[PDB]
Amino acid sequence: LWYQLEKEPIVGAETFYVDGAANRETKLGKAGYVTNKGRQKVVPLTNTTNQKTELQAIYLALQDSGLEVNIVTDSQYALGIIQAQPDKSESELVNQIIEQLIKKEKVYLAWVPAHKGIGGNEQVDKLVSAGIR
Ligand SMILES: O=C(O)Cc1cc(=O)oc2c(O)c(O)ccc12
Ligand SMILES: [Mn+2]
Ligand SMILES: [Mn+2]
């Protein structure tokens, strides 16, 4: 079915490093990205969870990118959902992400381990984590 993930990075395409952070007690969160072209975004979230913020971040990257995009996440949870290539989810947010994925021409989704010195990943982590932490 209909959408396909690239097997290797798209050379020359904007690369979005995404992350989210949420506070357990307070349920406040942030989602965001930084790109290799100097683009950045951080949005505040309420009544959220870590996994929801990580999915929110990918949705933003998808909304704000062109038809070809590389996305680098540290979330295995999100990776799983997207690599599974579902038709429909019970989650509205996942369905929105799916809708956006179909509208892309090429999407590469990479995973990196959190807090292991990957440049872009550390950058966005610091962004979304500030004030939440
Ligand atoms: O790697 C970990 O310890 C858990 C973890 C998973 C994830 O998806 O995102 C994370 C993150 O953004 C952090 O700042 C710290 C830990 C995680
Ligand atoms: Mn993360
Ligand atoms: Mn982080």
Curated annotation (Swiss-Prot):
Effect caused by changing Y77W: Almost no effect on RNAase H activity and replication. 6-fold resistance to inhibition by BBNH
Effect of substituting Y17W: Virions contain primarily p51 RT
Binding annotation for Mg(2+) 2: D19, E54, D74, D125
Listed result of changing F16L: No effect on cleavage between p51 RT and p15
Domain RNase H type-1 span(s) in chain numbering: 10-133
Effect listed in the UniProt record for changing Y17I: Almost complete loss of virion production
Effect upon mutating K88Q: In strain: Isolate PV22
Consequence of changing E105Q: In strain: Isolate PV22
Consequence recorded when altering F16V: Slight delays in replication. Virions contain primarily p51 RT
Name the UniProt record assigns to this protein: p15
Upper lineage: Viruses, Riboviria, Pararnavirae, Artverviricota, Revtraviricetes
